[PDB]
Amino acid sequence: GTSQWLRKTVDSAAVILFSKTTCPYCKKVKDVLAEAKIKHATIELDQLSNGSAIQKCLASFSKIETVPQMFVRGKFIGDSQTVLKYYSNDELAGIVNESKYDYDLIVIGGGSGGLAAGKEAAKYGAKTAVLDYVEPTPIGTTWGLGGTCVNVGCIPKKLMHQAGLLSHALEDAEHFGWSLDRSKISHNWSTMVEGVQSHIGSLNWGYKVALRDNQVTYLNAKGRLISPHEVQITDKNQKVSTITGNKIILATGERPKYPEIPGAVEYGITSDDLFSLPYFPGKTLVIGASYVALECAGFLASLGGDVTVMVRSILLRGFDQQMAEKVGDYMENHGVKFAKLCVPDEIKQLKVVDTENNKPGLLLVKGHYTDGKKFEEEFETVIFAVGREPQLSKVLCETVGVKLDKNGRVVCTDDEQTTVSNVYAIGDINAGKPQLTPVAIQAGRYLARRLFAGATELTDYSNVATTVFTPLEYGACGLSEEDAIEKYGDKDIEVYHSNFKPLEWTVAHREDNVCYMKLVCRKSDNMRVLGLHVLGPNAGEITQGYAVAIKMGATKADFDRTIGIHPTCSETFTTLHVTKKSGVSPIV
């Protein structure tokens, strides 16, 4: 086992040094490498239980057994004397820059995973290039480096969530003694957008400065894998060229879907355009039922918009459906309208968008209900949030041999390898993995360490916690309640649950039995917690820490023997006692 590991480590590392912590000849080579600004991986054999065998297996590559041993791209370079000799003779730089390929690593896609992979690999000497390019939306929207989350995702959408929550802060402030009158305050959309966009712009810039400071070539151009080690690039002026790389990481992500109906691409928008929209949407129709659909409808309504959501079948397919319905009911009771079991057939234009005065157009939406009734109504803006998909045919010449699934996502082993042995995929395009920014970062960074630093640690994709930032937030970790019953049988499942009420809602006179939380547990496994769910303020901050306990296999007794922090919302999890089978009510 040790042997096979050392062979894979030596073959892929760019510059790697085997060492011991207490050896002056190792120090001597380290000081030489630091002086000449040579970046490299370092493995200290005296801090590995396996290191004595490893020190013996290095003689397969170098025919010696002492430390230090320096390797470049699979080739043994020398012990202490030879490296110093290479240095003294002005030979060391040309040896470490020697390669079959232009780059040790080419990343296609400069988003969450792409930039994480690229920065980490550069730290261990891997000569790295990150490629990024933003195909404009149908109306021409575009943005800078950083990928979906930074530019048209988690970041601008949580800040617009914050401004939505500040409306209820203003309401709440009257009851706590502040003098303002909420009903004489209005919201200015473009002022909000300028502040959000300004923060994004500093992220774009910060990422560029990060790549430059890690010696990463950044190319603003479209990448096409034409063979295992050859990537074709087309830049902004349509100039076409080829670069080669030893390892290839695919991190191109996804883009929004449009329903195939007349008028949709012409007259609707998506989340890609919403976050830099120069005008307030006005009376808005959201077509879709995903978490994207509900978060966007949610903050548009809190900023004073007239909002309808058109629901084909159910809300939040794939999430715990009781939690989904609580989520939806909260929105409906605070000014979001729902058009349930409704599908659109057509969008007709009645006014073009007023580019000069920054005012929305006007649209007519025709649809029908399953009961036969026609849907017909006017909206100033129509947003589509009906899914997302990758566009790999534009990236992957099918003759290279990368296996895709029926949805067009890349099939990988559990270390992210594709069916082409030097090509990997991370993030939203990795088939079957949760589509989330921290996941893609963990995958990129861990993969970079396996390739260029001999690491073994894999990314763990199970029981990853999520949060939906609807007006009342919803956090979950683990199995939904229905899936657990599905997997183990109703008799083996015990669900503890309770309503609650934040102390902050008392003086502000908000609802009594609306916030909610439950633990789904397995009876035959010491009451193991299979899934946790909470609906309430600050649901993300509440949920995060419990994810660590659940990863370690927490049981109902672990929740019970811990003591709460008071006064908090999250403490209700430490004193739960009402089961569902008992039939007792969860209310306060």
Ligand X SMILES: CSc1nsc(NC(C)=O)n1
Residue 452 CB, nearest distance to a copy of itself (Å)? 17
466 is in an annotated binding site: no
Contact positions with a copy of itself (CB under 8 A) in 131-160: 149, 154-155, 158-159
409 binds ligand FAD per the rule CB under 6 A: no
Instruction: From the list ligand FAD, ligand X, a copy of itself, none, pick the one residue 540 interacts with, judged by a Cβ distance below 5 to 8 Å according to partner type.
Output: a copy of itself
Give the x-and-dash track for 542-561 against a copy of itself (CB under 8 A): xxxxxxxx-xx-x---xx-x
Are the beta carbons of 103 and 131 closer than 8 angstroms? Answer: no
Residue 375 CB, nearest distance to ligand X (Å)? 9
566 is in an annotated binding site: yes
Residue 181 CB, nearest distance to ligand X (Å)? 18
The single residue of 40, 334, 497, 566 carrying the catalytic annotation is 566
How many Å apart are CA 322 and CA 43, to the nearest integer?
51
Discontinuities after residues in the chain (C–N over 2.5 A)? none
How many Å apart are CA 335 and CA 337, to the nearest integer?
6
Which C-beta is closer to ligand X: that of 111 or that of 288? Answer: 288
Instruction: From the list a copy of itself, ligand X, ligand FAD, none, pick the one residue 263 interacts with, judged by a Cβ distance below 5 to 8 Å according to partner type.
Output: none
566 binds a copy of itself per the rule CB under 8 A: yes
223 is in an annotated binding site: yes
Residues 6+ apart with CB under 8 A from 440: 111, 112, 113, 116, 251, 426, 427, 428
How many Å apart are CA 454 and CA 11, to the nearest integer?
10
State the virtual CA torsion across 427, 430, 433, 436 in degrees, nearest 10.
20
Secondary structure class of 511 (helix, strand, coil): coil
Q: Which of 285, 287, 517, 535 binds ligand X (CB under 6 A)?
A: 287
343 binds ligand X per the rule CB under 6 A: yes
What is the helix (H) or strand (E) element at residue 379, kind and residue range? strand 374-379
Instruction: From the list ligand FAD, ligand X, a copy of itself, none, pick the one residue 134 interacts with, judged by a Cβ distance below 5 to 8 Å according to partner type.
Output: ligand FAD
Are the beta carbons of 128 and 104 closer than 8 angstroms? Answer: yes
Residue 175 CB, nearest distance to ligand FAD (Å)? 21
Q: Could you tell me how many residues make up the chain?
A: 588
Which window, 29-37, 123-131, 179-187, 232-240, contacts a copy of itself (CB under 8 A)? 179-187
Contact positions with a copy of itself (CB under 8 A) in 91-110: none
3-state secondary structure string across 516-578:
EEEEEEECCCCCEEEEEEEECCCHHHHHHHHHHHHHCCCEHHHHHHCCCCCCCCHHHHHCCCC
Give the x-and-dash track for 491-530 against ligand X (CB under 6 A): -----------x-x--------------------------
DSSP character for 162?
H
Instruction: From the list a copy of itself, ligand X, ligand FAD, none, pick the one residue 189 interacts with, judged by a Cβ distance below 5 to 8 Å according to partner type.
Output: a copy of itself
Residue 491 CB, nearest distance to ligand FAD (Å)? 36
Determine whether 566 is an active site residue.
yes
Nearest to 322 by CA among 186, 517, 154, 505: 517
328 binds ligand X per the rule CB under 6 A: no
Residue 315 CB, nearest distance to a copy of itself (Å)? 21
Which window, 61-69, 121-129, 131-139, 481-489, contacts ligand FAD (CB under 6 A)? 131-139
Per-residue b or e along 294-303, where b marks 16 or more CB atoms closer than 10 Å to that residue's CB? bbbbbbbbbb
Contact positions with ligand X (CB under 6 A) in 453-482: 471-472
CA atoms within 13 A on the CB side of 266: 13
Phi, psi of 518 (to 5 degrees): -145, 155
Quick count: other Cβ atoms within 10 Å of Cβ 347? 24
Contact positions with a copy of itself (CB under 8 A) in 513-542: 538, 540-542
Instruction: From the list a copy of itself, ligand X, ligand FAD, none, pick the one residue 128 interacts with, judged by a Cβ distance below 5 to 8 Å according to partner type.
Output: none
Sign of the CA dihedral running 372, 310, 330, 497: positive
Contact positions with ligand FAD (CB under 6 A) in 170-229: 222-223
164 binds ligand X per the rule CB under 6 A: no
Sign of the CA dihedral running 10, 15, 21, 23: positive
C-alpha distances in angstroms, 278 versus 40, 121, 145, 242?
47, 39, 21, 38
Question: Before 390, cis peptide (omega within 30)?
Answer: no
- Listed in order, strand segments (DSSP E) in 426-513 are 466-468, 474-478, 493-500
Give the x-and-dash track for 374-403 against ligand FAD (CB under 6 A): ---------------------x--------
Residues in the annotated binding site for NAD(+)? 288-295, 387
Binding residues for Ca(2+): 560, 562, 574
Residues recognised as catalytic: 566
- Residues near ligand FAD (CB under 6 A): 108-114, 131-134, 147-149, 153-154, 157, 222-223, 251-253, 271, 292, 395, 427-428, 435-438, 440, 566
Task: Detail the residues annotated as belonging to a binding site for FAD.
Answer: 112-114, 132-133, 148-149, 154, 157-158, 222-223, 252, 255, 291, 391, 428, 435, 437, 566
